[PDB]
Amino acid sequence: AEEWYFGKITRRESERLLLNPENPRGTFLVRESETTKGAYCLSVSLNVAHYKIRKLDSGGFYITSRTQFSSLQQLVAYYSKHADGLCHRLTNVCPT
């Protein structure tokens, strides 16, 4: 649950790590958002896309309202099976 979580890393640095030529499409990491407090961000790779992971006041997370999760790990497991709206399916955890 920690592997793909890079925490407080900048958007610029997440793009720099994801854009490594060794990383296949679908390489990703989850991080804290720099513009929206309380929310996270899923960065996936070749270009990088950034998705805001919003948090409901009751608890859960979601990128789009039609697909909600109890946690970041439930969100990651879901998009690792189907991109379902994302640019690509989550395939690889970004190397440190």
Binding site: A49, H50, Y51, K52, I63, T64, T67, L86, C87
Partner: peptide, 8 residues
Amino acid sequence: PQYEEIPI
């Protein structure tokens, strides 16, 4: 600049 949105 911005973020990608899952299409509606």
